[PDB]
Amino acid sequence: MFNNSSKILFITIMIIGTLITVTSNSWLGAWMGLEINLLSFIPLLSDNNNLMSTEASLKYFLTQVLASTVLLFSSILLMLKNNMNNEINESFTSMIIMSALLLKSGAAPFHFWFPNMMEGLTWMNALMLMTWQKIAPLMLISYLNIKYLLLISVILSVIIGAIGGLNQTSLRKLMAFSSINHLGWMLSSLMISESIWLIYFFFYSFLSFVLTFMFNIFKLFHLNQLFSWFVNSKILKFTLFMNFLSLGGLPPFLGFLPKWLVIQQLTLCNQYFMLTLMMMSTLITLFFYLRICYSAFMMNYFENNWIMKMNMNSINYNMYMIMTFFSIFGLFLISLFYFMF
Amino acid sequence: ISGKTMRGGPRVPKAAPYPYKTKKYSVFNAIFDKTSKRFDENSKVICVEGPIAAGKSKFAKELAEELDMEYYPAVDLDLIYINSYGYDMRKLDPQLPPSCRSYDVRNFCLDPSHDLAAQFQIRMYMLRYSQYIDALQHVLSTGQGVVLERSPYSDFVFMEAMFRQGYLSRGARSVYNELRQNTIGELLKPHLVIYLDLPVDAVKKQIKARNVDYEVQSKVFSDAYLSDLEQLYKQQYLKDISTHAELLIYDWTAGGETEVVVEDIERIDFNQFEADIHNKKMLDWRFPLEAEWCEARIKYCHEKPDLMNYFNVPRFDVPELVRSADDGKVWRDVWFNAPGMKYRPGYNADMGDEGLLTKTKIGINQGI
Amino acid sequence: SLTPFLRLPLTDLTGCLINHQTYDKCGKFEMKMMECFEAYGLERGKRECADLISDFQECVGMQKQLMRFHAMRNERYKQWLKGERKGQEFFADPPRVDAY
Amino acid sequence: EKSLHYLYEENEKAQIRLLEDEVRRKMSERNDYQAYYYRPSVAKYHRISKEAADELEALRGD
Amino acid sequence: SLLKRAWNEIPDIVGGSALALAGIVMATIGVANYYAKDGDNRRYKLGYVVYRHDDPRALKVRNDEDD
Amino acid sequence: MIQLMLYSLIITTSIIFLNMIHPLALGLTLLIQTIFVCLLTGLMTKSFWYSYILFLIFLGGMLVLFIYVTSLASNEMFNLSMKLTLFSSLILIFMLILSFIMDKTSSSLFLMNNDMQSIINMNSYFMENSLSLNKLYNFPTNFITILLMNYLLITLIVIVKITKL
Amino acid sequence: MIMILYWSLPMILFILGLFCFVSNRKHLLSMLLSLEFIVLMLFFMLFIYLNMLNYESYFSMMFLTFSVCEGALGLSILVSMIRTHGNDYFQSFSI
Numbered sequence A: 001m002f003n004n005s006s007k008i009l010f011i012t013i014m015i016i017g018t019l020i021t022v023t024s025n026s027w028l029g030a031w032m033g034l035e036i037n038l039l040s041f042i043p044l045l046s047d048n049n050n051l052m053s054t055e056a057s058l059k060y061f062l063t064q065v066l067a068s069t070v071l072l073f074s075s076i077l078l079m080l081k082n083n084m085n086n087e088i089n090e091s092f093t094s095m096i097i098m099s100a101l102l103l104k105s106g107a108a109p110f111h112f113w114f115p116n117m118m119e120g121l122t123w124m125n126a127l128m129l130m131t132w133q134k135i136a137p138l139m140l141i142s143y144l145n146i147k148y149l150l151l152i153s154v155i156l157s158v159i160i161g162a163i164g165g166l167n168q169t170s171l172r173k174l175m176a177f178s179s180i181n182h183l184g185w186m187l188s189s190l191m192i193s194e195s196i197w198l199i200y201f202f203f204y205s206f207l208s209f210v211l212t213f214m215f216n217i218f219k220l221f222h223l224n225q226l227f228s229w230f231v232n233s234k235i236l237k238f239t240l241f242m243n244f245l246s247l248g249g250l251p252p253f254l255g256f257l258p259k260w261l262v263i264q265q266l267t268l269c270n271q272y273f274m275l276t277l278m279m280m281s282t283l284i285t286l287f288f289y290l291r292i293c294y295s296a297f298m299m300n301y302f303e304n305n306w307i308m309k310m311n312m313n314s315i316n317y318n319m320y321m322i323m324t325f326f327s328i329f330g331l332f333l334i335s336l337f338y339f340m341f
Numbered sequence B: 001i002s003g004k005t006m007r008g009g010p011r012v013p014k015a016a017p018y019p020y021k022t023k024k025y026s027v028f029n030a031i032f033d034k035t036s037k038r039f040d041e042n043s044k045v046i047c048v049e050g051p052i053a054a055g056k057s058k059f060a061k062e063l064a065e066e067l068d069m070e071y072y073p074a075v076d077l078d079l080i081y082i083n084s085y086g087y088d089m090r091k092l093d094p095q096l097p098p099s100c101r102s103y104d105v106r107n108f109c110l111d112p113s114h115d116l117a118a119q120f121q122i123r124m125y126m127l128r129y130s131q132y133i134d135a136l137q138h139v140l141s142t143g144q145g146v147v148l149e150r151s152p153y154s155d156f157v158f159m160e161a162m163f164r165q166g167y168l169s170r171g172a173r174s175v176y177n178e179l180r181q182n183t184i185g186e187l188l189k190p191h192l193v194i195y196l197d198l199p200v201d202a203v204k205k206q207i208k209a210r211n212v213d214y215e216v217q218s219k220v221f222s223d224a225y226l227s228d229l230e231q232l233y234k235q236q237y238l239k240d241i242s243t244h245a246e247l248l249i250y251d252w253t254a255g256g257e258t259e260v261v262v263e264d265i266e267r268i269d270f271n272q273f274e275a276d277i278h279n280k281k282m283l284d285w286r287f288p289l290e291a292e293w294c295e296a297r298i299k300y301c302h303e304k305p306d307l308m309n310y311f312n313v314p315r316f317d318v319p320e321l322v323r324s325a326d327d328g329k330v331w332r333d334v335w336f337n338a339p340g341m342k343y344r345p346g347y348n349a350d351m352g353d354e355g356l357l358t359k360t361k362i363g364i365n366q367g368i
Numbered sequence C: 001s002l003t004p005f006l007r008l009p010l011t012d013l014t015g016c017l018i019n020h021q022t023y024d025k026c027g028k029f030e031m032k033m034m035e036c037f038e039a040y041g042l043e044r045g046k047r048e049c050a051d052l053i054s055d056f057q058e059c060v061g062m063q064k065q066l067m068r069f070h071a072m073r074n075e076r077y078k079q080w081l082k083g084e085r086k087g088q089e090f091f092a093d094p095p096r097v098d099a100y
Numbered sequence D: 001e002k003s004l005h006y007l008y009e010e011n012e013k014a015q016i017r018l019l020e021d022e023v024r025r026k027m028s029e030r031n032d033y034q035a036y037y038y039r040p041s042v043a044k045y046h047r048i049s050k051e052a053a054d055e056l057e058a059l060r061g062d
Numbered sequence E: 001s002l003l004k005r006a007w008n009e010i011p012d013i014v015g016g017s018a019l020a021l022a023g024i025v026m027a028t029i030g031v032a033n034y035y036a037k038d039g040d041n042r043r044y045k046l047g048y049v050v051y052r053h054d055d056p057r058a059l060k061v062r063n064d065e066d067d
Numbered sequence F: 001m002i003q004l005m006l007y008s009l010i011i012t013t014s015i016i017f018l019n020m021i022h023p024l025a026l027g028l029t030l031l032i033q034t035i036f037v038c039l040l041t042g043l044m045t046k047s048f049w050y051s052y053i054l055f056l057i058f059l060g061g062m063l064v065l066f067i068y069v070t071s072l073a074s075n076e077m078f079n080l081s082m083k084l085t086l087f088s089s090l091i092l093i094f095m096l097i098l099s100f101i102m103d104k105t106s107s108s109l110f111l112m113n114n115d116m117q118s119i120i121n122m123n124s125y126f127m128e129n130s131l132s133l134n135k136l137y138n139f140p141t142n143f144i145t146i147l148l149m150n151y152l153l154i155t156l157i158v159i160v161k162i163t164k165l
Numbered sequence G: 001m002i003m004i005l006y007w008s009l010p011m012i013l014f015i016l017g018l019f020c021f022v023s024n025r026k027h028l029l030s031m032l033l034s035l036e037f038i039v040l041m042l043f044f045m046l047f048i049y050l051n052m053l054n055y056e057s058y059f060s061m062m063f064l065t066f067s068v069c070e071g072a073l074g075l076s077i078l079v080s081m082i083r084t085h086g087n088d089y090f091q092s093f094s095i
């Protein structure tokens, strides 16, 4: 996505606008930063070579400006009812604020734009979409204290995001549906902590960088395209596909750690039924992760024989192999970590 | 385009030639080093197409030495079967299974009906597509124009030529059409196309005059295959490429003269197509801004692994292009335990490489 | 006011944008709330500082004053509709034009 | 004696873990202490705006 | 040279840039002249402004003649 | 009273905005809604600066893009219906006589004008449109309008890239 | 009450413009024009809020700048499909 320096300019201004959003002490400067982030994320997610990217940017524009005007209208309504930004007893205007934030984030009652837009993108604007663009709404969700909207969103996110990814054989829509399920674990962590959410979001972001770099360097967009992917040693293809088992939450790899910290903090906060509802609905996520892992866990395949050289970037794959090592051997660093406490 | 005879000497570059085979060209290299500062009238891509017996290497060599350009030779399958260290992988044929053995154009000349031939043409496309980008990296980064004996735009003519004689199935046509529809829209069309016209009998006469030991006593070059390809050139490939590239028909049934076609090239005005913005001719090279020029240079000097990873189409419904898994395993155990390709090129200590303990230089656009 | 999650240099501009501190009928009420939110924080300030919250909201929100005005105007119209008050004594002595 | 020492260490760790769970529960019940369960609301911007509005009263003139 | 080319092709923009440079110079001159004296304490206040003698602002009033 | 007239006009133009479908006709309904919105926001305020700002920015500045795009989008003319005009006139006369039979003191807005303020208010006598616009050009809120001008330049840079020129 | 008599009408017209924004009987240009209708209603409600405070009305040209940049962004998104989807994409009833 670095074909121009103007895209680097749009990247730093969308970083600036997101930081204006998450540091605003009022409900209107947050909307100001949301509009800055929207202005800088319209030209990214748009390109001349791909036809679907322009209508996907149209879908993003209509979804975000529908969500931002409802966010502005409800914040002005809250300010008209009580003139401070906070609220003593929570009421329906906070529900409209949280629903407008859930349309921005992509919770499962309002998530239907997310994989339908994801069906026509590249793998770097998807990396910006499921990681950085989830910063601006989710950090405003932590300011509200209503429980049942978060409960409905978490439950609907972990059933709908896990079941709906089974039919999808495109890798982008499957990763969007997997990010919808990993969104629900972040909102379940938001009801109990503002630090365990940062733990889950940072390592989910880390897993998103290391897993979307596999599909961006080698240009993989399909489940059948993974079977035809040529790696010179099949042990390396087997080892590189352990990031799916890592992100699915398996104990020897990293990615078990943030889910485990969410489990540890939720049980200490006496919330057991919602945890069971999420973890019976996270096995389906590992099922469509293991359906990807059909293409590497067996050691020999009926490969197409016209391609015999593996072509790859140098700097991007050099950054990829550092993060693949810490995705599967990163549980040795739990003794050095001190940010859980 | 101006020749050496009218100019009175060699051409001068407008800027320093960028070492595109050593230094990468990212956006942080594109901030400082501009790419439209070294372009002139001799920065065109010329493809010299024709039948299989027409003299095109000699003509492209004298056109490159006359118009001050670089001659890119025709691709052959020695580029895969001989590695960077010079070892020939045709000597691994008894170790390889018979469904995964070597298949050069010599094996096509004696045995055109083999199942590997449907792979072979695709491999030829993977050497034309890999050459043209290597041509484009010479145009955008150094400013010197290139001349090509063969182009990937004209490789489908040979595909339907082996299809019409019966050497390919319908599935081989389908997978080559899928690969072409996946890949041909990512590389810029040439500026100028020269077709060295030959009749079907003179092609056979030049084939028996060349006396190459596999062209003679081969049933491939019959009166139907050559006629099919010369018909198919002039009514598919030339008609497709004339919308963008200038098309020059030259009666090459004689020995052919070089000064007359340089004269015919030099009277072509190249600036009249840039007056109309939405003109079909030279549309792919019409970049109105320097940022679009640098994006076009980045697309071929830095994003060549993307265009080489665009050949990753899965099509398992054909039985003659699917390598079986035990054969693929023993093919890996033979091919990647060779003296040439045990490691990446430049890092194999078995074939005379030293200083590997302090060497961390990978290389640019290197096949692994 | 909302507590931001991060305290970066980028909150320095957004923070002063809306505030009753610039001359206003009762920004001195809001300051008496705001320093209270420095004392107990945001969450204990919702409970331990509820008396100073309602005065600022009463002043600038103008809730009970407008509700009392609408109670005094609807009762007068109800007395008009019920026949107790009618004629030229429906409206009282008007104020002077520079009284307020 | 090694098992006795390890059991004593693990038992004392259990008591300190129970006590810090109780302390954290009483801290989150009241939002009293300034380390955890505390949302720092600052009126630095309000005092800055009030100081600026007091400074522009001197600037008012001709 | 370079200024001759700009004065040949675009003379109004050169004259406007000279005017803008002169305006920037006299803007800095006006700022330095405003802050060299007590420009923050204006002579002619708006409204009805009174200070008692115990206030610190009453000792900073200007007793200059009307200009 | 005239505030209730602007309420009635905005209601009538909004329901005909919901009814009609021709894109230049919705653009015309927006340009005639913007005038009533400007006047009605002028009724609450001390002075008419922000109504003028909304006027130049929205109507004369921005909606001309909408009028141009909707003019080149539709080849055909308006199909004027006397039924919709009669219904709009009937609901307009009904809402004006409803404002006639309603007490205007209770229906007036609580937001103070420049003359609704106290006579002893020192700040109202100084200069029209002075203290409200002051925080645009003072510390520390000048960084927002510097960021706004930078935002408009960056917006132009975005628009040139996305239209592809 | 206070909400029924004051600022009730911007809420009702905001919901009407929201329903015009999302109805399947309209087109994309109608969505953009109804979007600027709810921008106008948002300005109305924001100015009713900002005039309870005396001298904070300067924020009205900040929201104006952001929403006008949104409207120009939406128009430049919509007309960028002219060279790709043709001139008939303005009549599309579905996305």
Ligand SMILES: CCCCCCCCCCCCCCCCCC(=O)OC[C@H](COP(=O)([O-])OCC[N+](C)(C)C)OC(=O)CCCCCCCCCCCCCCCCC
Pocket: E009, E010, E011, E012, E014, E015, E016, E018, E019
């Ligand atoms: C009572 C008066 C009687 C006489 C006048 C009667 C008529 C009333 C007045 C009418 C005026 C004419 C109206 C129509 C004009 C039509 C022509 C037109 O638009 O021309 C545009 C032309 C166009 O410029 P141009 O001529 O450079 O462009 C054409 C040439 N090409 C395209 C090749 C570049 O002129 C201008 O725009 C000039 C700029 C405005 C005027 C100059 C202001 C400069 C700043 C002030 C001085 C700066 C300091 C100088 C000294 C110090 C220097 C270091």
Ligand SMILES: Nc1nc2c(ncn2[C@H]2C[C@H](O)[C@@H](COP(=O)(O)OP(=O)(O)OP(=O)(O)O)O2)c(=O)[nH]1
Pocket: B051, B052, B053, B054, B055, B056, B057, B058, B074, B105, B108, B121, B124, B149, B155, B158, B162, B215
């Ligand atoms: N199957 C197949 N055969 C090809 C293809 N391209 C070339 N050939 C074969 C056909 C002929 O035997 C021979 C073509 O000869 P060339 O085009 O290389 O020209 P040649 O070297 O004879 O003369 P020249 O160098 O042009 O003077 O190679 C291809 O794409 N597929």
